[PDB]
Amino acid sequence: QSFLNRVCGVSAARLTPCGTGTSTDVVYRAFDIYNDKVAGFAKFLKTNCCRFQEKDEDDNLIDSYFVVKRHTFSNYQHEETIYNLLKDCPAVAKHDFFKFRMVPHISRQRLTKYTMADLVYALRHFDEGNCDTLKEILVTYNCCDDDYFNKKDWYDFVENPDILRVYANLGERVRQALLKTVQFCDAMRNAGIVGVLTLDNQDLNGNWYDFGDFIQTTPGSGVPVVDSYYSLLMPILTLTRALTAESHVDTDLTKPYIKWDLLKYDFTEERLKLFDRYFKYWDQTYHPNCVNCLDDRCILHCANFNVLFSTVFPPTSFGPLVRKIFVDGVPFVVSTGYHFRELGVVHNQDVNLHSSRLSFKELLVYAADPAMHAASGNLLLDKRTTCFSVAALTNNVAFQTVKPGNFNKDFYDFAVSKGFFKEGSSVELKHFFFAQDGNAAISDYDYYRYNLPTMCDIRQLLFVVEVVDKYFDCYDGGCINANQVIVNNLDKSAGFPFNKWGKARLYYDSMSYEDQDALFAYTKRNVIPTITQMNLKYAISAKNRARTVAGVSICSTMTNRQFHQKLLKSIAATRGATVVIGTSKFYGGWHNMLKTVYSDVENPHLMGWDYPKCDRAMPNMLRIMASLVLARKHTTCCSLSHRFYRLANECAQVLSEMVMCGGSLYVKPGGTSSGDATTAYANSVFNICQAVTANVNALLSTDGNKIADKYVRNLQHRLYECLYRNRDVDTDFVNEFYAYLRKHFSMMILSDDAVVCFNSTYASQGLVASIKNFKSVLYYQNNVFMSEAKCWTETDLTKGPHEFCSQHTMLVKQGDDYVYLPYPDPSRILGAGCFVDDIVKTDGTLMIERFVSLAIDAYPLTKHPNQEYADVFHLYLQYIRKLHDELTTSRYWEPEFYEAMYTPHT
Amino acid sequence: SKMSDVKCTSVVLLSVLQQLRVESSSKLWAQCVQLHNDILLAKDTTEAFEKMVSLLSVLLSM
Amino acid sequence: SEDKRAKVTSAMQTMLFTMLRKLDNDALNNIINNARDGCVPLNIIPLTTAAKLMVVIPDYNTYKNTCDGTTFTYASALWEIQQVVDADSKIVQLSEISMDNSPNLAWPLIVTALRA
RNA sequence: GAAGCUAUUAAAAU
RNA sequence: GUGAUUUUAAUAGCUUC
Ligand SMILES: [Zn+2]
Ligand SMILES: [Zn+2]
Q1: For residue B36, what are the domain limits?
Q2: Nucleotide in closest CA–C1' contact with A849
Q3: N or C end of chain C, less CB within 10 A?
Q4: What whole-number distance in Å separates Cα of residue C16 and Cα of residue A738?
């Protein structure tokens, strides 16, 4: 009681013990430390403070707490001096220095239970079954009722989109903490005290409490290091929508919104004021317009801030910045500049306001530009979607339907005669041609609502991109001329509005090599926005989802080819690397891929995964990162200005552009387009980045005191240092980390698909990632929740990957050796046989190639333990004989022809 | 054997209805598509028969 | 490949001249000449110049919320309903849009209005 | 015939 | 009104060996 009343002191408050009498409590909380011995942000134990729960006049427990700390008499004498210097600041909690039994006691009064470190760790290391701290914080701060957690899948971003509002209820608290830390930094600077600011030394009210390691200097030379603080805090800002109060007048949530002018688009001063108000002591220089940046790293750094400041400004100030030129006296409306959400304002350099006449190149540019199409149209208001509706090109709305698939009665009846489709068969029909209604196209386009503005931890991303670029240093890239470009099928759509006059062959035949080169040189100094058309895809599937694809225009496709053709061909030609695009599964190409990933890992276990809605949810920061990584091969052919303008063109054409869906224009929030010239390679880059980030988080979130291996402990220490305390790139450590990854986390990547061989002891001890360290990374950097349904594990090597590229794996004997053979799904093969898209292809005697190709893919099943699986292949061989006999080469219906297709010798 | 016949017959029936210019009536096309998809996604013969005869009644009505 | 090109060249120019005749030159000139340097965002030209608006309504609740009555207001302007058309391109009168006839109606409806 | 090349058609994967 | 990329098969033609 004596200790309790001494702790109470002059601040009248009834306090109950929180612990065992007069002792020190033991709590488990998250900390951020960088000692010469241990470094990293993880959870540790605290036994140096005694807690004192506080009650009110109604004598029910409230969130106030009295925390007393017992430490070296030296800390006492010192902190006391520092607190005396920093007494006047309103962002500093109240301390009452005293001694009780004569051990010194530092009292911190009126503190919340949890800290910003706890909040940040809970949101950045989310686990579905270990979310007690997050649930308690949400309940305590009135973000949601205690019964909200009885709703299953409350944590999903897709099934429960109300969790976005529940999370956004914390924005005001986070903003208050930001303002208070700015106040504290200014106070230290005035006092002349240097010290490191960490999250764990700040309360959820924004009050600072630790002062042991603050060195005192002369007044006016105070230096507060906040790099780790701000970088670790960055991802939470957009998640909780901290800056949502800035859109009101005088930044007051009870006021009306600000009526911004419609003709204003600059916002440079607003961005600068926001930066100076919030990130005042951030050391690195900030460019509101990335056209003034100096490198790709600086572009990433500034665009990361731009994605956050862009939420304040109205959504109608982004897009092309049109003008009014006069062609031989005839006035036109052309787009000159462009306002990016991530790159600021870009102005074209070759602008001519008086064209005597326009040639083929100028006609192509003006026809691809959407300014005329949007200006000549009618206003559109579409309540079927939540996207911004730009205009309506026609006087009617177009509804697209999907027809059913045809039925092959001959093949079906032959299969019935051959004993398939019997009751209880493990082989059943699962793949069909699902039909859709009129509104399927717009309903599937509305799935872009899953794209949420995501801000990334920039200091972590800058090291991750450097590590990822090592995976692509074994290729050759650069720009090629117009006569070295290879186009596979010239009879394809040229996009809107070019598809009203011909196919892609017409324009390639019309414009010469000189004109193509001139257009490519134009794209390196100006921006050309283009319209994309969304088309429905008509295919066989196991789910009724109206899959839609984007048909990019010829003006974009041609110039992207002339920019990425060389690198993409080199990637497709290289064999035995991480990216396996171009490697055939025929002639042992499977075995050769599986041996390359098995490599020589020590305790091998296999794991794999796929992304939920990869194209719709992919953050724009990661998309720009992948584009910069691919464009890093142009160090000799293009300068910084040319590379930046090419990046701006790529963003304005395939990142957020006007999209045509049934005669109406809608703006794309972001993501990726399935019609790009670089879709698969960008997906591979994104996959590698997410895996590397998972590994970095798994290593850094581990207690360094429990790591027995001195090499690994030193590696973790230098990883933390090179990530948060070094601003330049350390090539030696980048190489060392890359070698560590290659030795213990091997990878095979094809777009959004990946198979991984890893050490199962390092994964057990927390030194490499797992399928839990990937739900956490996805949850905070991709705004999705990965379930156990897209995640598999295999502790065996004989049984290969559970699933890769839709094939399974088997270890069969081909002669004297054991090989691995990829076998697909019987149901898929039978469905492809029975249901066809064209009515003409139902004639068996006129389509032999279909069944020959289907038998090539169904051959492996002949060697499956399940007998009724192997009988699928023999069905196709007995049907091929019938087709030839009805028509009137024995090679097709002999097994050795197909057996020769999975044999090493070519 | 029981389910496969139902699903194939459903595919043929919806194709016939599409050829008979049912897309012109959006309200009919929506219900026909919904019944076809539910039959193709069904698991037991009980509900597939009911949705199949429901879809066949549309053809019998014209 | 030479006269094949000479066909599409006059097709692009014809389209690039037809759309100019559709521009609202009386109002567009004011918006352009009121900017700081004559440069304006594209997303506001239809909003502040379009003389015709098309609204697509999913169901009756949204209809009642948005396009109630003969005249409504949107985008700081007054629009007068001129015609309503269902998904079958059938003329729909304003009288049978209600609670009772909503199931009989074939949604969505495409409302066409003219600026005041 | 050995191999290469051009054209059309078809199947699969992302 | 029907996208980007990769592998494979079939028919046909041509030049080499
Ligand atoms: Zn910069
Ligand atoms: Zn280049």
Answers
A1: 3-62
A2: D10
A3: C
A4: 55
- The Å distance, CA of A906 to C1' of D3, is 13
Residue C96's domain comprises 27-116
Ranges of H-type helices in B1-62: 2-19, 26-41, 45-60
Residues in chain B with CB shorter than 8 Å from the CB of C108 are none
Alpha-carbon span A86 to A92, nearest angstrom: 8
Half-sphere exposure of A268 (CA within 13 A, CB side): 11
CA distances from A434 to A811, A857, B17, C99 (A): 35, 24, 15, 33
Phi-psi region of A544 (alpha: psi -120 to 50; beta: other; left: phi over 0): beta
Q: State the burial class of residue C115 (Cβ atoms within 10 Å of its Cβ: 0-12, 13-18, 19+).
A: middle
Structure tokens at A824: 């697909």
Do residues A301 and A284 lie in contact, with contact meaning Cβ atoms separated by under 8 Å? yes
Residue A301 has a CB neighbour count (10 Å cut-off) of 20
Per the DSSP assignment, residues forming a β-bridge with C56 are A382, C110
Q: Catalytic one among A317, A556, A673, A751?
A: A751
CATH of the domain at C60: 3.30.70.3540
C-alpha span between A451 and A730 (Å, rounded)? 34
- The CATH number given to A447-458+577-619+671-805 is 3.30.70.270
User: How far is it, in rounded angstroms, from Cα A134 to Cα A779?
Assistant: 14
Give the pair of three-digit tokens for residue A815: 């002669």
Nucleotides of chain D in contact with protein CB (under 7 A) are 8-14
Distance CA A862, CA A869 (A): 8
Which of residues 523 to 542 on A have a Cβ less than 7 angstroms from any strand D atom? Answer: 540
**Tally of domains in chain B:** 1
**CA-CA distance, A778 to A780, in Å (whole number)?**
6
Q: CB under 8 Å, gap of 24 or more: what pairs does B5-8 form? A: B6/B39, B6/B42, B6/B45, B6/B48, B6/B49, B6/B52, B7/A429, B7/A432, B7/B39, B7/B40, B7/B48, B8/A407, B8/A412, B8/A834
A674 is catalytic: no
Asked if residue A684 keeps its beta carbon closer than 7 A to nucleic acid strand D, the reply is no
Query: From CA A114, how far away is CA A121, in angstroms rounded?
Result: 11
Here the tokens at position A114 are: 């949890």
Q: Which helix (H) or strand (E) holds A79?
A: helix A73-85
Cis peptide before A331 (omega within 30 of 0): no
User: DSSP letter at A16?
Assistant: E
C40 domain-assigned: yes
Helix, strand, coil distribution of chain C in percent, nearest 5: 40, 25, 35
How many Å is the Cα radius of gyration of chain B? 11
- Alpha-carbon span A315 to A310, nearest angstrom: 9
Burial class of A887 by CB neighbour count within 10 A (0 to 12, 13 to 18, 19+): exposed
User: Whose CA is closest to A455, among A320, A624, A280?
Assistant: A624
Paired with A607 in beta bridges are A756, A793
Which residues touch A444 (CB under 8 Å, ≥6 apart)? A545, A546, A547, A548
Q: Kindly list the distances between the CA atom of residue A46 and the CA atoms of A29, A69, A97, in Å, as whole numbers in the listed order.
A: 7, 11, 20
Structural domain count, chain C: 1
Cα–Cα distances in Å, from A355 out to A476, A674, C22, C28?
A: 41, 36, 22, 21
List phi, psi (to 5°) of A522.
-65, -40
* Nearest residue to B8 (alpha-carbon basis) of B44, B48, B47: B48
Are A412 and B8 in contact (CB < 8 Å)? yes
C-alpha A305 to ligand 1 mean position (Å)? 10
Q: Is residue C19 part of a domain?
A: no
Distance CA C84, CA C72 (A): 14
